[PDB]
């Protein structure tokens, strides 16, 4: 459960991400594919080489969805409804992988927000990514 303070922390941090959201999304993906190669089993149809348009494009989609979630943090289940349907009935990514991407997103943020990524913000962001992950896996069964 996100406390008001958590929501303030997430809005502040993501605010500073602003326009780089797509670039950070792609970086997080690349970090995930290199650190946790098992995640590549879900992207056999992509060119996963560095700088690939497919990864950049996907990174931007992931980032926009997170932007949408931050904007509607009080109403995430509704805001992400179409995305939970998509992952539950179509993509069917095993839930363990959400953790892996969440960690890589956190690392990406840490590497780009030296001043913003305080212990308290780190905690709030991890909580937020866990909530997004929970919503996206809500309808799996």
């Amino acid at each position: 459960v996100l406390s008001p303070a958590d929501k303030t922390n997430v809005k502040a941090a993501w605010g500073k991400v602003g326009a780089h959201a797509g670039e950070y999304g792609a970086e997080a993906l690349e970090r995930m594919f290199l650190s946790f190669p098992t995640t590549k089993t879900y992207f056999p149809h992509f060119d996963l080489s560095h700088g690939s348009a497919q990864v950049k494009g996907h990174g931007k989609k992931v980032a926009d969805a997170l932007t949408n979630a931050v904007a509607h943090v009080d109403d995430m289940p509704n805001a992400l409804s179409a995305l939970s349907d998509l992952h539950a009935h179509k993509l069917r990514v095993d839930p363990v992988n959400f953790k892996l991407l969440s960690h890589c997103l956190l690392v990406t943020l840490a590497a780009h927000l030296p001043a913003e990524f305080t212990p308290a913000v780190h905690a709030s962001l991890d909580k937020f990514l866990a909530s997004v992950s929970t919503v996206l896996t809500s309808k799996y069964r």
């Binding site: 190669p37 098992t38 995640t39 089993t41 879900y42 056999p44 539950a88 069917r92 990514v93 095993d94 363990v96 992988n97 799996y140 069964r141």
Partner: protein
Amino acid sequence: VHLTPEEKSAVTALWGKVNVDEVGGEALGRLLVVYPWTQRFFESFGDLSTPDAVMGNPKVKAHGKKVLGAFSDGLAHLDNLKGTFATLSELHCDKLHVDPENFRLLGNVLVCVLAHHFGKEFTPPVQAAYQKVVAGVANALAHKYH
């Protein structure tokens, strides 16, 4: 892996009583029912829409038998699961694109099936031995991923 001789003989003894075809079909079917996202690899298989459809699906049964047969053969080489499963590991990564987390899920469902099948004979020590084996097999199958 590393089993004590009493664990090894526990695994061996119980397995001599297993109908591999039947337990295979059951374990794969229950995997597809309890964790429906695993159905992702099998849409070539027909009707998987209800529990009864999954459990009665002949392709599910056939594949279950193929999987448990390979598993069976690995019980004969508990000292070197990685060598035994290296080719299959490669295949599941490069060609089939199966997230190795699926191997862990199947291992746990298999333990539930053995428990259901054997009842009180599937004692806590025997379960412990089988948990080591299924973790070992999952490991071995994930070893050549990249």
